[PDB]
Structure formats: structure tokens, C-alpha cells
Amino acid sequence: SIPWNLERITPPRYRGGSLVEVYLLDTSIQSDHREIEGRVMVTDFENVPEEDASKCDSHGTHLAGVVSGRDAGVAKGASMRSLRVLNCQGKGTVSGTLIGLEFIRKSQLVQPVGPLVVLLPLAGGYSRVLNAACQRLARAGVVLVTAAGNFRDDACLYSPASAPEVITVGATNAQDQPVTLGTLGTNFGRCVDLFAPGEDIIGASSDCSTCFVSQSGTSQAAAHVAGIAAMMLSAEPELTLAELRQRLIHFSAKDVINEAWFPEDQRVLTPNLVAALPPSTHGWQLFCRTVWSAHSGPTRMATAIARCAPDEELLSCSSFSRSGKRRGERMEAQGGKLVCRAHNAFGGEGVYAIARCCLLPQANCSVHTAPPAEASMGTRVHCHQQGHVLTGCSSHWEVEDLQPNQCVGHREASIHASCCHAPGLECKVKEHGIPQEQVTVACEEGWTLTGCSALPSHVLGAYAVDNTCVVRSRAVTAVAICCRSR
Amino acid sequence: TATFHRCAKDPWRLPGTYVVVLKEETHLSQSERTARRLQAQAARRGYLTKILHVFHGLLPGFLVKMSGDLLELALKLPHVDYIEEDSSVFAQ
Numbered sequence: 121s122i123p124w125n126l127e128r129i130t131p132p133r134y135r136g137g138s139l140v141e142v143y144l145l146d147t148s149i150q151s152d153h154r155e156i157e158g159r160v161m162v163t164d165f166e167n168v169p170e171e172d173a174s175k176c177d178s179h180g181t182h183l184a185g186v187v188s189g190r191d192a193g194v195a196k197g198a199s200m201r202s203l204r205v206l207n208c209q210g211k212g213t214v215s216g217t218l219i220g221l222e223f224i225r226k227s228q229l230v231q232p233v234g235p236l237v238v239l240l241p242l243a244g245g246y247s248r249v250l251n252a253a254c255q256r257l258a259r260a261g262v263v264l265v266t267a268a269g270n271f272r273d274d275a276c277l278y279s280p281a282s283a284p285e286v287i288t289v290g291a292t293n294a295q296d297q298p299v300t301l302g303t304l305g306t307n308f309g310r311c312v313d314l315f316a317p318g319e320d321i322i323g324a325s326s327d328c329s330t331c332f333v334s335q336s337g338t339s340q341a342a343a344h345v346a347g348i349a350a351m352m353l354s355a356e357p358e359l360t361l362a363e364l365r366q367r368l369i370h371f372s373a374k375d376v377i378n379e380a381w382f383p384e385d386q387r388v389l390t391p392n393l394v395a396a397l398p399p400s401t402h403g404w405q406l407f408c409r410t411v412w413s414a415h416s417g418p419t420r421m422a423t424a425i426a427r428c429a430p431d432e433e434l435l436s437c438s439s440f441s442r443s444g445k446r447r448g449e450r451m452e453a454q455g456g457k458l459v460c461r462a463h464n465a466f467g468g469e470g471v472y473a474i475a476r477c478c479l480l481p482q483a484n485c486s487v488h489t490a491p492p493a494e495a496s497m498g499t500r501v502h503c504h505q506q507g508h509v510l511t512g513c514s515s516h517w518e519v520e521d522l523q524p525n526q527c528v529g530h531r532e533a534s535i536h537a538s539c540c541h542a543p544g545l546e547c548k549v550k551e552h553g554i555p556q557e558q559v560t561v562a563c564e565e566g567w568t569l570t571g572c573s574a575l576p577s578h579v580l581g582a583y584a585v586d587n588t589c590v591v592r593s594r595a596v597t598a599v600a601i602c603c604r605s606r
Numbered sequence: 607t608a609t610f611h612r613c614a615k616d617p618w619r620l621p622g623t624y625v626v627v628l629k630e631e632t633h634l635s636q637s638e639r640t641a642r643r644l645q646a647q648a649a650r651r652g653y654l655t656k657i658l659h660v661f662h663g664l665l666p667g668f669l670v671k672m673s674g675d676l677l678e679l680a681l682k683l684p685h686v687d688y689i690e691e692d693s694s695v696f697a698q
């Protein structure tokens with residue numbers, strides 16, 4: 121009898137959302153529906169383009185019910201406030217959406233409450249200004265959750281989906297597969313943070329005050345994550361966006377989507393995660409996430425930059441090109457904070473920089489670099505200070521072509537070690553090599569992959585997938601640095 | 607350094623209304639004055655304009671209904687970071 125979607129997000133151990141407020145920017149809603157009556161406040165903010173009542177409020181009413189519905193909601197608690205930025209046909213404007221986001225911010229300034237979650241169950245094409253407004257609102261301390269888009273396309277081509285500070289949510293079905301929606305479906309790619317239930321999702325129907333309807337879409341998916349965020353933030357109100365995002369990733373079901381559904385090049389970029397509520401079972405734990413940059417493009421001196429959140433540490437840096445035409449990557453400081461920079465090769469189509477960004481308080485991390493040795497034992501650098509741990513190795517080169525706490529690179533390459541004093545931290549290195557398109561090595565359960573690299577036959581790149589280090593080539597050896605709280 | 611942007615998905619564009627985004631630390635008073643300056647400079651060229659909204663609180667700027675003919679003029683206003691043509695979003 122429990123709707124499948126609400127079971128899907130229920131953790132393997134369990135025992136909301138009231139300190140938190142969820143804003144909805146959507147169609148009008150039927151606020152007297154019994155799922156949401158007395159829990160949703162209609163602001164009567166409205167900014168919608170002209171068309172070109174049961175039907176008018178169908179989308180918004182359903183989503184308010186997915187977020188907060190008495191019977192079928194995720195955060196059955198929670199308080200919501202609704203702004204109308206979509207017309208009866210489900211169409212809005214970027215300007216109306218901006219004015220809506222601004223209204224939320226002004227409301228907060230005038231009457232401050234606790235954590236705010238803003239659900240944006242809508243998409244247009246890439247918009248600089250909409251992305252900027254979202255970023256500003258995120259930087260102002262509001263959590264934003266948006267739909268990936270229903271275009272079976274790269275979410276980076278859409279907004280607000282493409283805004284990095286917004287939690288972007290794709291849709292999966294009861295079989296944990298990406299949702300098909302007519303001839304299209306859930307968007308995917310590196311701007312999607314995670315997936316959530318978004319097919320056959322039962323919720324309030326604005327047909328009648330006690331009626332229900334199943335709807336499908338990445339809006340529905342996003343509503344689940346808005347609900348989960350509201351619950352998580354009620355439990356841990358002080359979470360930074362980066363802490364909340366790391367929890368959303370950490371508590372997700374992993375590696376359950378068949379990535380064959382996605383275009384080939386998007387498989388590696390698309391997180392294989394289906395959202396879930398945190399278990400009741402939960403001291404401190406090491407959380408890391410893999411941040412893929414925008415592709416650098418083909419310019420000869422092109423660089424891709426993957427950055428971490430202000431409160432995260434960059435523990436490693438890798439790179440990847442589908443051609444393998446690559447000058448590697450380096451961890452470089454920037455505004456007093458380390459970023460992962462990857463370098464394209466001459467004639468390369470471009471490369472991705474792939475950061476491993478981790479929540480490590482009390483860590484003092486640095487980078488130790490050595491230039492090409494040009495001889496014999498390869499280029500080597502180590503974390504020489506007593507008690508510092510190596511968390512990541514990177515290597516870049518400028519040429520057209522070719523032991524604890526030590527990184528080793530090619531003799532013609534520079535080598536970079538991420539070294540942290542993190543006294544609560546234990547790390548080990550696990551290696552695996554074989555004769556081969558992909559080699560793979562996983563950290564042990566309860567350990568967090570901090571770094572992933574290939575021993576220095578032509579590798580396309582390396583990247584962490586959850587706690588598995590993947591090395592891609594055209595004996596090749598994957599090397600994972602795995603750490604945990606001690 | 608002021609740039610113009612419009613939606614790559616041509617059907618989703620809404621020509622004739624523009625979001626004028628001013629540089630980060632621009633003050634509301636400066637945004638309002640910039641809007642007025644635009645309307646005055648437009649009027650002198652024979653163009654009707656309407657300032658639909660003045661943004662402050664997240665981004666400074668304004669929303670203006672005007673002919674795109676005025677965009678080169680608008681890009682030369684003080685404080686302008688970029689201007690974006692309005693466009694459509696859709697329920698997902």
C-alpha cells in the first residue's frame with residue numbers, strides 16, 4: 121500500500137521537515153486539498169506569461185503533495201509557501217522566475233526563519249542570468265533543488281539544471297531505470313547531482329480535494345529531493361550546502377541505474393545515484409564526492425577546472441579525455457584554495473578535470489610538486505613531514521608525447537602530491553592491474569576513496585566512481601588511496 | 607566588457623523584453639538611475655520603453671520592455687554586466 125517511491129527512499133534502517141520551509145515556484149495550487157491543507161501557504165506572488173482551474177493547478181498541487189502531503193508526501197511535516205511562476209499551461213518566463221527568487225530572498229530578509237529549501241520544478245535552456253540568480257541565492261544560504269529537465273538530454277544545456285550550486289535531480293522509475301517520457305525522458309550528464317523517483321508518483325490531484333493522480337517527470341523527482349533535504353535539514357539544521365550535498369550522495373542507492381540508457385559519452389558523467397532518506401543508524405565520517413569540470417574545449421592551451429565548495433578540501437585531482445589526448449592535471453592554488461586543473465593536448469578535443477572534494481575538518485592540506493626528473497626512476501614527490509598522509513597523486517606534462525606517501529610519474533612529467541595533516545585520518549593504498557579498456561579497484565567498505573590514478577598502456581584517464589577507482593585505456597594498473605576516520 | 611545573451615533554443619526566446627544585469631556591487635539607487643537613463647536615451651531616439659521591474663536583493667538590474675534596437679545603447683550604460691533577452695521555462 122505504501123507508494124513505491126516512498127518505499128524507495130526509505131532507508132534500510134528507520135524509526136518531518138518542520139523547522140524547514142520549502143518554497144515552491146510552480147503553477148497555481150489547490151491549497152485546500154486535504155494532503156496539503158494548512159501546510160501550504162499561497163503567497164499570491166504571481167508572474168506568468170499569458171496563455172497561448174483543475175488543469176491550471178494540476179502540476180503545482182501534485183508537487184506540493186509529493187513534498188509535504190499528509191498521506192503521500194516525503195516530508196509529511198513540512199511547511200510550504202507557493203509562488204506562481206507557471207501559467208495554466210505550465211509555461212513561465214526567466215524574468216518571472218528571477219522575480220520569484222528575488223521575492224523569496226526579500227521575504228527571508230523581512231522575516232527570517234530557519235533553513236529554506238526552494239524547489240524549482242521547471243527548466244528552460246541555459247540561462248546565464250537564471251543560473252546567476254540561483255548561485256547568488258545559494259550563496260546567501262538557501263538550498264535550491266531543481267528538475268534536471270525532461271528532454272533526454274544533457275542537463276548542462278538547461279537552466280536552472282545547469283547551475284552548480286543548485287541540486288539537480290533526474291528521474292528514475294520503479295525499476296531504478298531512467299524515466300522515459302514519450303519520445304524523451306529524464307535529462308542526464310554531469311550537471312545532474314542524483315536521481316530520484318519520478319515515474320508513476322502518486323500525489324494530490326487538483327481534480328478534487330481528496331483525489332490523487334500519478335504523474336511522472338523530473339519535477340516529481342526533484343520534489344522527492346526537496347522533501348529529503350527538508351528532512352535532513354530538520355535533523356541537522358546547521359548543514360552547509362556542501363554537507364547537505366555530500367549526505368544526499370552518501371545516503372543514495374548506488375550503481376542501480378543501467379547506464380546503457382544514456383548516450384555513451386554521458387555514462388561516465390552521469391551519477392549513478394538514487395536518492396534516499398538517511399537511516400536512523402546515523403560520530404564523524406569522511407565524505408567525498410567526484411566533481412567533473414566542464415569539458416575544456418579543443419584550444420591547444422585549454423584547461424578544465426574542477427573546484428570544491430568553500431568548506432571542502434580537494435584531496436585529489438584526475439582527468440579524462442575520450443581520445444586520450446591529454447597533458448594530465450595538476451592541483452593548483454587559486455583565491456587561497458586548491459583547484460583541480462587539467463590540460464588539453466595539442467590536437468586534443470579537450471579534457472575534463474575531475475576533483476575529489478571531501479569534508480575534512482581540522483585538515484591542513486598542501487600540494488608537493490616536482491618537475492620532470494627527465495631520468496630513470498620517473499618523477500617522484502612525497503609527503504615528507506611527520507604524520508602527513510598522501511591523499512592524491514596528479515601528474516601533468518608539457519611534452520607532445522612520452523613507498524609511503526610518495527607519488528611517481530613519468531620522467532618527462534611533473535608530479536603532484538596532495539599531503540594532509542589530518543590526525544584522525546588513516547589511509548591505505550590498494551592497487552590492481554591487468555593485461556583492456558577499463559581497470560577497476562575499490563576501497564573496502566567503510567573506507568572513502570580520496571584518490572584514483574593509473575600507475576605510469578595509453579590511458580584515457582582515471583576517475584573515482586563512489587569508492588571505486590576507474591582507469592580507462594585504449595599491464596595497466598589502477599591505484600586507489602582509501603581513507604577513513606581513525 | 608558588457609555582453610548580450612539570448613536563448614540558444616530559438617523557439618523559447620521572448621524578444622522585446624530584456625533583463626539588464628548590472629555589476630555585483632551596484633546599488634539599487636544606481637540601478638534605478640540606470641533604468642531612467644536608458645528610458646531617456648531611448649525616448650530621445652524615438653523609442654518607447656517600459657521598466658517592468660527593478661531587481662535588487664539577488665542581482666542588481668532591471669527588466670525592460672523595449673526594442674532590441676536599443677541593445678547597443680543599453681550595453682553602454684554605466685554599471686552594465688550583461689543583458690539577457692527574456693525566455694521561456696516550462697513545468698517538468
Ligand SMILES: *[C@@H]1O[C@H](CO)[C@@H](O)[C@H](O)[C@H]1NC(C)=O
Nearest residue numbers: 482483484540541542543544
Ligand atoms: C592546522 O594549522 C593550524 C594553523 O597553524 C593549526 O591551528 C592546527 O593545529 C593545524 N591542524 C593540523 C591537524 O595540523
Ligand SMILES: [Ca+2]
Nearest residue numbers: 283286288311
Ligand atoms: Ca546541479
